[PDB]
Structures are given as structure tokens and as C-alpha cells.
Amino acid sequence: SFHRAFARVVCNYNKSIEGSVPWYQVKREKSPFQQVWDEVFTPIWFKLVKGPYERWEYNALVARYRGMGIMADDAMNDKDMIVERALDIIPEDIRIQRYRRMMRGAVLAGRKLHLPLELQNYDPMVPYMAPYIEEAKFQMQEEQELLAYHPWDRRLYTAGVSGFGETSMHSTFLTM
Amino acid sequence: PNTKRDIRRLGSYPVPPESKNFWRGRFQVPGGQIQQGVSPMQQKIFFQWWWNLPTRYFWRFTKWSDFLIPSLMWYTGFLMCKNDVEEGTRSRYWY
Amino acid sequence: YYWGSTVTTEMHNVSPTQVTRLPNGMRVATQFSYTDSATVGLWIDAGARYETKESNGTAHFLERVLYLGTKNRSRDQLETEVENLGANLNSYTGREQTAFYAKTTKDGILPCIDILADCILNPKLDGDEIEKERVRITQDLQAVNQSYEELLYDKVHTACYRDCSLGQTVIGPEENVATIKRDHMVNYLYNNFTADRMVLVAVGPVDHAQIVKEAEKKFANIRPTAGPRMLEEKPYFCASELVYRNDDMGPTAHIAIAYEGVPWRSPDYITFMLMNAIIGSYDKKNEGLVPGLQSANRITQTGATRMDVGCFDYYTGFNIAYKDTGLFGFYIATDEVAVEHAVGDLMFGVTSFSYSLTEEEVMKAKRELKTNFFSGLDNTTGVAEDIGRQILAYGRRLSPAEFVERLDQIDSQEVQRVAWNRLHDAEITMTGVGPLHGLLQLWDLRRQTWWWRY
Amino acid sequence: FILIIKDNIILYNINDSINYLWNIGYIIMVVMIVQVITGIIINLYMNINNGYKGIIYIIKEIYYGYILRYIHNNNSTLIYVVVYLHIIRNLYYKTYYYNILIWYSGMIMLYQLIIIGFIGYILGWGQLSYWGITVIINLISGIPYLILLISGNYYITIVTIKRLYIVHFILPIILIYVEIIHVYYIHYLINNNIVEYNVNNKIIFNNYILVKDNNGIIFILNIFILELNNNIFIIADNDNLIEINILVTPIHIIPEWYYLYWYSILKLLPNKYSGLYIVVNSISIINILSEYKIVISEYKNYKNIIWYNQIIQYISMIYIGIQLPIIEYINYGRYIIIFNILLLIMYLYPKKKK
Amino acid sequence: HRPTTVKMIDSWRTEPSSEKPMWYNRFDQVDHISQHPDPEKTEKYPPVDDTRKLMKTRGDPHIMRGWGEYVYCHYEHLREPVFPRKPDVAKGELAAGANVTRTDVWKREGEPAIQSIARFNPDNFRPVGYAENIPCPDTCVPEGHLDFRHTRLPTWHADRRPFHYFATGMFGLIGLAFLRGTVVKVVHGLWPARDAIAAGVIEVDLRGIQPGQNFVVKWRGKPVFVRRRTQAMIDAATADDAIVNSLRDPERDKDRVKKPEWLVMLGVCTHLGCVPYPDQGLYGGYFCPCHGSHYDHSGRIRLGPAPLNMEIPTYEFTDDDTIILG
């Protein structure tokens, strides 16, 4: 049987790379060719194209946030699961101000108005969600590894759920 | 659905969305009952047709004999009309 | 796939079980243990199966009356003597095996052999004792006085084994219980309690030679043998339903579904033990460290998610083995409205053994099977049950090392082969009590033993 | 919608005691699908400017086009046979007594089917087709300027065919939608049983009822294939293979067999409008058969004498339609109409107490 | 409840149940429901052996009158009057509903009213003979009827699974064959029809043509020039066969004609589709007058706006004096 031979090859290979250091954790020296490219192309490209374009986009983004009176981390959409899991655990004082800022922004945007300049002198790029995003990613990675390492077989279209993995009832068209 | 008393459920587990109709036909069995059966894979699957054959047809025919008199009267009407039609045609046309 | 040997040096460090056959044919088995307490008993090959339809229930009646006095002693004297030794006489009777053992201190090992021999060989089956026990047995026989687990256990045998004596219940029908008399019991003792069918098991601070010398002295006058049992065909497994639909007993429904299993000595028995461990057991009221929603057991995990409530208030697998047949299945206790999901999920789980069983689930199950088995051998009575049951079932006691050696060979592929041969597209029996509107017909449930996918 | 399918096919419960007469509805649903499919395919080749030459072209030039032509014609006969038998079935067991909403949903499909079948017959574009629609349309000549708007000319022409074709193409699709309202009410308002009362013996549909329903539909297919390929029963009048002549009438002007009952009613009554109204009466009067009853009973499982006389009355009226307009037939037909009225009054009237 | 209706009305012709009961109006009254006899423990009537010996029934066949379909029943929906007829419980008539509440039948002489009204609870009335007539089934399968205990196969039987799956497999086997035949046949109808396939093949009878003559055959909607070529015409194209690569579309006459004497080409100018006229131009070949394209005796473009050579259709020679286009 060829599947048995293939299974042994996979087992032996994976056993031979256990404990390997990830590529990013290796101390890597650039090749003599990438160093030349960085010496010539990268400086000129930054001065003439990348630097000005990205400053132009960044400064516009800061202005847009300041006009709405929101922070950058407010702009995250909770349809993303990491954001939703992080928002479950944020403390109440952070939550209250986040909601108020987001509500004011939508009112301003909907009515085509901008925040008064008196209230615009703040840094919008303060990363207040970072501790909770990292905790949420850790929780999700543990669940991924210890509980979702195989494609599981379940009885199909039973109890309001397709049986293909989703956990909410009536959350697909074929489960109406 | 059945009566409200019949479909009143004892358990608090919610009715699955795919069994709505199944649980609207629930019955409240009074006094209990013992149900027994055997898988068709361990039974004769055609003998019951033969065993029940004569009684099935006897009771079918005795019930259908109730329509004997009505059918004869309608048939008697069918014959009179058919031969009343022939005589009329001949009288009006034949010489 | 083979992942190595799990046998350890500690598994080999256990005192040997010495089994010798006395001239009369009685086997004497002993294991020494560094304990201050011992267990000595007689595990006899007898039970309801070997009773005839008219006499069914005699064995159970005899077991209850055996300790109620002997020809030499009296009930008060016997009970007083055992108490003075600080011991307690126990006994049980099953479909195929019976036991009469005593838990005692070290000094009471040999005295207890005498008491147990006197009870077994010279029972004084006084009429007054019989009549009082008739009242107690009659009350026990009532279904209202039985648990629903006990009822289903008997009804599974009644439904599965309609053609043979394994279908008979141990307690017996009420008609027989009403008519049993001393003569019935005297005949059963003479025919069934013979040396060739008895094993004297002693576990504790015991010496094999001394136990053997006492056994030969006290069981000298036992009947050496009885005629060989009738030769019979393989018990026929009847795929049937026996469901007691009662909507006046509350919300919980009890269901048991059975497949044909394997005999004790089958090469596949250990595979069926492992499959029983993979099915596992779950209780909403004792979930354990891991919640159902995050369980490694696939049946448990999918069940806990159903309708955001869970479709299993309780379930357990069962693997019952007899000399020439066995039963393998699961028992469920669940809400009335959950029965269709529960039976469907536990049948989908058994069908999965034939198609998609992961190495991870097998390896977890091997460890929890070993933990259950080894922990059962902790006390002397646990060891004694193991020695006696095994010698009757196999003629020898399998060592912990041998059990692990054979279990090492079993893998996901072996489980798949055995399940494909025996459980896939197989016939099933369903039994039930309680509100069972949700339970479908046997044929509908029998179609869940195979998959359209794969 | 896989959980809706599972709730109405897989875990749908029905009584075990039903007969094969409960399989008729399933047969209607399946043959209806076939009629829609074969119609769509036939229109890939059909010529609406001359229906007479289109049929010839399909039968001779298209590969296996004869199968499409004969299936569509013969399956229409089967649709009416099965539907009428379903109506007779419902009348016999008086399923309308409590499941009136099911009866109402069904009658709508009956009304639509009548229009569908008639216009389709016209699309053949033969002698009977032209003269049949000419006669029927004159019934509404009383309403001013209504005939001109419907026909699109002063006589039936291809202009009329073009517009009737659109109704024939679309109305059957609406009929399929009404079949969903019919099945919705059947599944909510549980079906009747051969016994009057409601009993606890239901089994799931997919594993038991569907197997039995397939056995019935395969048995009907063995009969339909014999008719389809060999024409063991004359179910299409031959006069529709004659080219249309607007100046000469055919020997007789009659519809398909399944319209004969209504055709005779008109031919019998002297006044044209009275004939139309009696046609209206027969279909509408059976919608209120149980409405005036006052007793706790569904009149079920008696000797059903009135029922049997009514079924034979339909058969005899169908027989009179085939015959020429002989005076003697007219007299007897009128007696049958009077007799039918008395039977319906027996159904409607509640009983007094001795 | 779902939309529902009852005929609880005041009829103009039919009396209410209180006025005229339709049931046998003889009931036995107790003081407490426990005083009723137990049907299960009550002896029934002695069994008969002939259907003609069965007992008589208490029902009145003619309980109802007037026009309408025959029916026997005991109950109706009609409304009662606020002052209903007083029932004769002394004789056994049933007292339940309005005839109890809106009457004084319940009143005894010296009994406390609470005790008197307690007796007229509906549970205290049972029809005379209830315990001796009502059936008390012990099973749904009477003795003598077939059941699983009679149809079970012998224990030495053979497996019935293999044949069962053969039967259900055969249903699928035949069904799939009918399905494939239906699908293929329907798709087949879209192939060009018998009239069209027939018209798409024209046979050229090269018999009667003269060297140098050009004739036109309408083939699949297009003009197909079929010209017999004189030796001069053939030699002319052969001469240009050497100057190939000096032509807009280099092609050799050998690769455009199957037989040198016969040139079959589609007569459609490659510029804008106009049909060229033969024996015209500078090469005596085919000149399209629309915009001035000149083709040679092999049909190759030699001058004008046209970009390519006139196409050679698919055609074979059936014999020496017949071609088949297509």
C-alpha cells in the first residue's frame, strides 16, 4: 500500500525538524547581493517615492482620526474574531471611553461634520488595545492547537448547525 | 398539530429546528405500552401478504357489494337511454 | 501505527499468582500481598444461564439463604463467629459466574475457609429462612422497586437472547419465585456446586502451601464432578426492540442500544475493551476537570454542543462478555426531547470507528483503560475478583505486563478492522424505558451503522 | 434550506394505516414536474407562427422529438386522471370536513389546471383547436368588447396564439408555487387516516412512506410507458390533425376527454348563460359541503351511497358528451343534472332531531 | 389554537341536547367516582359463536330526521337556553352542564347544599352497563393474528443483507440507466436536425463541366466557386508557385487543390466579404469589384485591399466526377 509508505515518509520528515528554530529567530546576515541592493535602490527609493507617499498617507490618516475624534485602535472592526475576543476582556473604564468616542465619530461622519479643532490635539496612535489583543491571540492559539488539530467528523445538518464546524445555530443559508 | 394536552412536553430540552413537525404529532400515552419488533433482516418479508390475502379480499368484496343495487339501477338507466335513442332515431329518420 | 512499547519495569514487579489443581479438580489460586487484610473465597462456574426455565431463580434464592445457618452452626452463631474474627462474608450470583468470599484479617484467613466450606457443602436451608426470603425476593422482583439501569440491563438480555438461557434473569420470574422450595435448592447445589467448577482464591499475607492444605482438608467431601454441560450452538443474537413507553415517570428517558460482541477468549476482546474505553462515559453532574465542550472524547464534545444545552445527561459504554457470546453498546439517560440527538450522536460515534478514528483518541483511551484496570487491582478484594473472574473466563490470569503487551499491538487500524468486520452495517437491539416519543424504529436506527460519506 | 427539507421529508411523521390512495398526491407532484420540463424542452423547437407545422417538425426532424411530443400530450391526460382520482379520494373520506384549508388550496390548483390544459390544447393549431376556442369564447360575447380584447382580432388568429402561449408558459409555474401552500397546510394540519379518529401510530416518511410511494409511482409508470409508446387507449381525438379551415366546421367540436363533463353541461342546458352558470356551480358548490353541519361527526365510513352515485353521475355525464346532440340524450342528461343537484343538497343539509 | 370555528348557534329547526338528548338517557349516579364498578374486574357478556347471536344495541337507528345524508351520533354543538329543561335524574337521565347549574335538580331535601352539589359532579355519572360492555384490550395483536413471533426466520438461516442490498442496488442501477438515456436523448435533440444535416451536404457532379467554366454552389450559406481549370490556368498558378514568399499570403497551388484540374474555393473576398467575379482582374482569376482585389487562378490574393487568400472549403472527391462538400 502506497499510503502506508507515504505515512512513514511524513512521520520521519517531521521527526527530523522538531525543535527547529523559526526563520525569524535566526541571526541572519544579508548576502553580498542584498547588501548592494540596499545600498543603492533602497535609499533613493525612500527619498523619492516610498518616503513621501507613505508620509502623505499616514498624515492623512492621522487627520481623519483627529477629525472624527477617535483613536486608531477604535477603528478596528469587531467582525474580526481576534478583535471580538479581545473586546470581551477589556476593562470597563477603557470600554466606556471607547464607546463614547466611536459614537461621536459616527454622528460627526453621518452629519458631515468634523471635531472642533480645540479637541484635536491628541496622539491618535496610542496602542491601548495591545495588551488585550495579545492575550486574545494567546487564548485562540491554545484553542487552535489543543482542540482543532484535525478535521473532525460530525453528524450533518442537525441541531441547527451544518456539522462542518460552525457553532451558532441558523448561521448559514443552508441552515436558514 | 395534536391537542394541546397531547403535545405538551415533559422535558425541558428545546425542540430541535429539524424536528418541529415531529414533536407537533406527539401523543400523551396513558397507562404505558410495551412495543416489540424484529429487524426485517431476520424475518420473512413476503409471507404476511400471502397469509392475509384471502381475508383481505373477502372483506373488500363484501364492503363493495353495498354498491350493487345503485350500480344496477344506473346500469338499467344506461340501457333504457341507449335503446330509447335508437328507437327515436329510427322513428324520425328511417322509413 | 506503532508507537513503541509501554511496558515498564514496575509492571514486572508483582507477586506471581500460583494456581494448583487439587486431586478432586478444584483449582486453588493465591497471590501474596504485603497487607494486613486478606480476601478468601470460592468463585464457582454457575448461574442463571445454567438453570432451566422452570427452575430459573433457584440460584439467586440459594445465594441469599446460604449464609442463613448451616447444619453445624446457626444463623446467630455463624454471624457471631464472623464478627468475632472481624470479618464479613459476601456473595453474589450472575448469569454465568457466582462467588462466595470473605474479607478478613490475617489471622482469620484459615477460619474463614472453614466457614465458607461449611456454608457451601452443608447448607441448612431451613423452611422459615426460605419463606422470609421469599417475601424479600418478591418485593425485589417488583419493577417499581428496581432501578431503571437494572431494568434495562435485564431487558437487553431478554431482547438479544430470545432463543437461549442467557435471556433469563438472575432473580427469575415471579411464578418461579413463588414455588421454589428446599428441594430445588438442594438439587442446584448437587448439580452445579462441584469441585471441577470451583476456584479457591486467597489474596493477602497468605502462603500457597498452607491454603492448599486447608482447602484439601475442608473440601474433601465435595462432589468431584458433574456431567459435562450440554453442547449448544452459538447464542443467536436477535435484532429486536423492547421499549416500555411510559409518559408518567418524569422527564428522563433511559435507552440501551446493543451490538453483538465477542466472547471472553476471542482474540478481539481486548480490541472491544479499547473501543469501550473510547466511547467512554459522561455525566452532566460530574463533568471532571475538562468540560464537555472541550473534551477529547469526540462523542462527549459533539454532544455538549447540541442546542447550546447538551444532549446527554448521562451515558456510558458497555462491553459484556460470556463464554460464547458478548454484547457491546451504550446506555443513555437523557431528556425526552433529546433522545433522537443522543442516540444519533452515540451511533455516529460507533460508526466512526469503522471510518475515521484518530491515533490521538486511541492513545488517550489506552491510558485511561490502563488506569481503570490497574486501579481496580489496588485492594485485595479487587485482586481476588480479578483472579477468580479471569481463571473462570480464561483458565489463567493475564498479567498486567501481558495485557499491556497485547494492548500495545492494537492501534487505530486494528480498531478499524475489527469494527468494519463486526460493527459496521451490523444488526442492533434497542431497549428503553420512559418517555420515548423521540426514539425511532429499529430499522431507522440500524441505518446509522454505516455512512454515505467515505 | 437543508433543515427545512429534513423537517418535511426525513423527520415527517405519517400514520401507518394509510392506503395506496394516499400515494396519489405524490404522483401528481412528480408528473407535474415532468410536464413542466418537457414543455420547456419542446419550446426549444416549437414554432408559434404555425403550431401545425411545428408538431410535424418535432416528430420527424428532431432526434427523439417524438418522445417529447407524445409525453407532453399523454402526460397531460395522466395529470388529469391522477388529479380527478385525488378529488374522488378526498370526497370519499370527506377529508374536507376538518382540513378545509387543504381543500381550498387544492381547488385553486384545480382552477389553474383547467386554464392551463385548455390553452395548451389550442396551441396544437388543428381543426378542433381553432373551433373549440371559437365556441367557448362566444360564451362571453355578452360582455361588450371583451372578445375583441382577448382575441386581439375579430377572429382567432396567430395574434391570439401568441398571447395564450405566454399564459401557458407562466401559469404552470404559479401552480407549482401553490403546491407549496398545499404541502404547508398538509404538514401543519395533519393528514386524515382511514379511521375517523386520531391515533398514535406514525412513522417517518423517508424510510417507509417514500418507498411505498415509489412502488406506486413505478407501477403507474409501467402503464404510462405502454400508453406512451403504443397508444393502447385513444386519449387524443384524431380530428386535431386536420388543418384549420375557418369556413368549414369539423364533424364534431369537442375538447379532450377531461373536459367532457363540463362540455355536456353546456350542450344540455338550453340557455347559454345557464349552462355556464351550472358549470360554475359544480366546482364551487363542493367547497361548502360540510359548512352547514351541526353534529359532532364527519359522516365518515358509512356506506357512502351518495358518494357512489355522484361518481357514476360524473361518468355518465362524460359519456353523454361523446354522443351527438340527439334529443333523447338531452332529456336524460337533464335528469342527471337534476339528480346531481339533489345529491349535493343531501350533502349540504343538516339533520333535524326526531 | 389555530383559526377554528364551532357551530354553537341557536338553530331555527333543531332542538338543543338539553331539550332532546340523542343518546340513551339512562346513567347510574354514584357519590364518589371510586364507587363505580371496575370494568377490568367486571364480567362481560357471554361470548357468542355466530354473528347472528351477538347482542342488541341500545342506539336508535332513527334518532334524526329530515333531508340529508344518514348519520348516527349522540352529540351536537347547539347552544342551550338559560332556563334548560329539568332532567329526570330519578329515572336515570344524565344531569351535566346547564341542566345542573341553571336548574335545581341537584337539590335534595335536608342534605347540606355543599354535599348535594358534590354528587352531581360529571365524574359520578356513568352509562348503565359501562363495566359490562366497554372493551378492555390487553394487546393490539389479538390471538390468532400473525406477528414477529411467527415470521422470525430459523436460526440456521443465511444472511439476508447481501440480497437486500442487491435489490436496492438494482433499483439504483435501472434508475441511473433511465436517467442517462433521458439526459443524452434531450441533449441529442440540439444537434443539427435531420433536415439541416441533409442540406449541409452538396454533391458536385463534375459531369458536364467544361474546362475553364466556373459554377457556384450555395453551401452552408456561402458561395462555393467550383472551377475546372484549363492547362493554361494550372500552369499559371504553378509559375507563381516558384515566386512564393513574394505573396501577401504565401501558399502553393498544390496545397490549395486536391486535383489540379479542379479548384474548389469559397467565393468570399477576404477584405469585406463581397463575392468576387471570375475571369476578371489582372491575373484572369477572380476580381472583387467592391474595392479592387485581384486573385490569381489558384485563389491567392495578388493585388488590392484584401489581406488573405480565398479559403478552401472542406471537400473530398467521391470519385473522378463527383465531389462531396462537407
Ligand SMILES: CCCCCCCCCCCCCCCCCC(=O)OC[C@H](COP(=O)([O-])OCC(O)COP(=O)([O-])OC[C@@H](COC(=O)CCCCCCCCCCCCCCCCC)OC(=O)CCCCCCCCCCCCCCCCC)OC(=O)CCCCCCCCCCCCCCCCC
Ligand atoms: C521527483 C522524484 C522522483 C519521482 C518518482 C515517482 C514515483 C512514482 C511513480 C512510480 C509508480 C509505481 C506504481 C506501482 C504500482 C504497483 C501495482 C501493483 O503491483 O499493484 C499493487 C497495488 C496496490 O495494492 P495494495 O497493496 O492492495 O493497495 C491497494 C491500494 O490501491 C494502494 O493504494 P493507496 O491506498 O496508497 O491509495 C492510492 C492509490 C490511488 O491513487 C490515485 O488514484 C490517486 C488519485 C489522486 C487524484 C487524481 C485526480 C485526477 C487527476 C488527473 C490529472 C490528469 C492530467 C493530464 C495532463 C495532460 C497534459 C499534460 O494509488 C494506487 O492505486 C497506485 C497506482 C499504481 C499505478 C497504476 C495506476 C496509475 C494511474 C493510471 C492512469 C492511466 C490513465 C490513462 C488515460 C488514457 C487516456 C486515453 O495495486 C493497485 O491497487 C494498483 C492499481 C490501482 C488502480 C489503477 C487503475 C487500474 C485500471 C484497470 C482497468 C481494468 C479494465 C478491465 C476491462 C475489462 C473489460 C471486459
Ligand SMILES: CCCCCCCCCCCCCCCCCC(=O)OC[C@H](COP(=O)([O-])OCC(O)COP(=O)([O-])OC[C@@H](COC(=O)CCCCCCCCCCCCCCCCC)OC(=O)CCCCCCCCCCCCCCCCC)OC(=O)CCCCCCCCCCCCCCCCC
Ligand atoms: C488535463 C486534465 C486535468 C484533470 C485534473 C483533475 C483534477 C480533479 C480535481 C477534483 C477536485 C479537487 C478539489 C481540491 C480542493 C482543495 C481545497 C483545499 O485545500 O481545501 C482545504 C480546506 C481546509 O481549509 P482550512 O482553512 O484548513 O479549514 C477549513 C475550516 O475553516 C476549518 O476546518 P476544520 O477541519 O476545523 O473544520 C471541520 C470540518 C471543516 O469542513 C469543511 O471545511 C467543509 C466546508 C463546507 C463544505 C460545504 C459547502 C456548502 C455546499 C457548497 C455547494 C453548493 C451547491 C452544491 C449542489 C449543486 C447542485 C446544482 O471538517 C470536516 O467536516 C472533515 C470532513 C469533511 C468531509 C465530509 C464529507 C461529507 C460532506 C460532503 C461535502 C464535503 C466533501 C469534502 C470537500 C470536497 C472539496 C472539493 O478544506 C476545504 O476546502 C473543505 C471543502 C470545501 C469545498 C467543497 C467544494 C465541493 C465541490 C463544489 C463544486 C466545485 C466545482 C469547481 C471545480 C471543481 C474541480 C477543482
Ligand SMILES: CCCCCCCCCCCCCCCCCC(=O)OC[C@H](COP(=O)([O-])OCC(O)COP(=O)([O-])OC[C@@H](COC(=O)CCCCCCCCCCCCCCCCC)OC(=O)CCCCCCCCCCCCCCCCC)OC(=O)CCCCCCCCCCCCCCCCC
Ligand atoms: C482558464 C479557464 C478557467 C475557467 C473558469 C471557470 C472554472 C470552473 C468552475 C467555476 C465554478 C466554481 C464553483 C465553486 C463552488 C464553491 C462551493 C462552495 O464552497 O460553496 C460554499 C461556499 C460558502 O463557504 P463557507 O461559508 O465557508 O461554507 C460553510 C457553510 O456550510 C456553507 O453553507 P452556506 O449555506 O453558508 O453556503 C452555501 C452556498 C453555496 O452556493 C453558492 O454560494 C453558489 C455555489 C454554486 C455556484 C453556481 C454554479 C453554476 C455552474 C453550473 C451550471 C452551468 C450550466 C452550463 C450549461 C451549458 C449549456 C450549454 O449557498 C447555497 O448553497 C445556495 C443554494 C441555493 C439553491 C436555490 C435553488 C432554487 C430553490 C430550490 C429548487 C427549486 C424549487 C423547487 C421546484 C420544484 C418544481 C415542482 O461558497 C462560497 O463562498 C463561494 C460561492 C461562489 C463564488 C464564486 C466562485 C468563482 C469561481 C472562480 C472561477 C470563476 C471564473 C469566472 C466565471 C464567469 C462565469 C460567467
Ligand SMILES: CCCCCCCCCCCCCCCCCC(=O)OC[C@H](COP(=O)([O-])OCC(O)COP(=O)([O-])OC[C@@H](COC(=O)CCCCCCCCCCCCCCCCC)OC(=O)CCCCCCCCCCCCCCCCC)OC(=O)CCCCCCCCCCCCCCCCC
Ligand atoms: C325573474 C327572476 C328574478 C330572480 C331574482 C333572484 C334574486 C335573489 C337574491 C338572493 C340574494 C343572495 C342570498 C344569499 C343568502 C346567503 C345566506 C348565507 O350564506 O347564510 C349562511 C348562514 C350561515 O349560518 P350558520 O349559523 O353559520 O349555520 C347555520 C347552520 O348550518 C344551521 O342553521 P339552522 O339549523 O338554524 O337552519 C336554518 C335553515 C334556514 O334555511 C332557510 O330558511 C333556507 C330555505 C331555502 C329554501 C329554498 C327552496 C327553493 C325551492 C324552489 C321551488 C320552486 C317551485 C317551482 C314551482 C313551479 C310550478 C309551475 O337552514 C337550513 O335548514 C339549511 C340551509 C342550507 C343552505 C344551502 C345553501 C345552498 C345554496 C345554493 C343552492 C342552489 C344551487 C344548486 C342549484 C342551482 C341550479 C338550479 O346560513 C344560514 O343562516 C341559513 C341560510 C340558508 C339560506 C339558503 C337559501 C337558499 C335559496 C335558494 C333559492 C332557490 C330559488 C329557486 C327558484 C325556482 C323557481 C321556479
Ligand SMILES: CCCCCCCCCCCCCCCCCC(=O)OC[C@H](COP(=O)([O-])OCC(O)COP(=O)([O-])OC[C@@H](COC(=O)CCCCCCCCCCCCCCCCC)OC(=O)CCCCCCCCCCCCCCCCC)OC(=O)CCCCCCCCCCCCCCCCC
Ligand atoms: C422529477 C421527476 C422525474 C423527471 C425525470 C426526467 C424526465 C424528463 C422528460 C423526458 C424527456 C424525454 C426522454 C425520455 C426517455 C426515457 C427512456 C430512456 O431514457 O431510455 C433509455 C434507455 C433506452 O435504451 P437505449 O438508450 O436505446 O440503449 C442504449 C444502449 O443500451 C447502450 O448505450 P450505447 O450503446 O450508446 O453505449 C454502449 C457503450 C457505452 O460505453 C461506455 O460508456 C463504456 C466506456 C466507459 C469507459 C470508462 C472509463 C473510466 C476510467 C477512465 C480512466 C481514469 C483514470 C484515472 C487515473 C487517476 C490517476 C491519478 O457500452 C458498451 O459498448 C458496453 C461495453 C463496455 C466495455 C467497457 C470496457 C472498458 C475497458 C477499459 C480499459 C482500460 C485499461 C487501461 C490500461 C492502460 C492505462 C494506461 O433505457 C434502457 O435501455 C433501460 C435499461 C435499464 C436497465 C436494464 C438492465 C436490467 C438488469 C436486470 C438485472 C436483474 C436480473 C438478474 C438475472 C440473474 C440470473 C441468474
Ligand SMILES: COC1=C(OC)C(=O)C(C/C=C(\C)CC/C=C(\C)CC/C=C(\C)CC/C=C(\C)CC/C=C(\C)CC/C=C(\C)CC/C=C(\C)CCC=C(C)C)=C(C)C1=O
Ligand atoms: C366548446 O366546447 C367546449 C370545450 O372545448 C372547446 C371545453 O374545453 C369546455 C370546458 C373548458 C373549461 C372548463 C376551461 C376553458 C378555459 C379557458 C377558456 C381558458 C382561457 C384563458 C385564460 C383564462 C388565460 C388567462 C389566465 C388567467 C386569468 C390566470 C388564471 C389563474 C388564476 C386566475 C388563478 C390565480 C391567478 C393567477 C395564477 C394569476 C397570477 C398573476 C400574476 C402572477 C400577476 C402579477 C402582476 C404583477 C404586476 C406583480 C366547455 C364547457 C365547452 O363547451
Ligand code: HEM
Ligand atoms: C400542468 C402543465 C401543463 C399541461 C397540462 C400542458 C398541456 C398541454 C397540452 C394538452 C398541449 C397540446 C397537446 C397536443 O398538441 O395535442 C400542450 C402543448 C404545449 N405545451 Fe403544455 N402543458 C403544461 C405545461 C407546459 C409548460 C410549462 C410549457 C412550457 C414551459 C408548455 C409548453 C407547451 C408547448 C410549446 C406546447 C406546444 C406543443 C404541442 O403542440 O403539444 N406546456 N400543453
Ligand code: HEM
Ligand atoms: C396540482 C394538484 C394537486 C397536488 C400537487 C396535490 C398534492 C397533494 C398531496 C401530496 C397530498 C398529501 C398526500 C396525500 O394525501 O396524498 C394532498 C392532500 C390533500 N389534497 Fe391535494 N393535490 C392537488 C390537488 C388537490 C385538489 C384539487 C384538492 C381538492 C379538490 C385537493 C385536496 C386535498 C386534500 C383534502 C388533501 C388531504 C388529504 C388527507 O387529509 O388525507 N388536492 N394533495
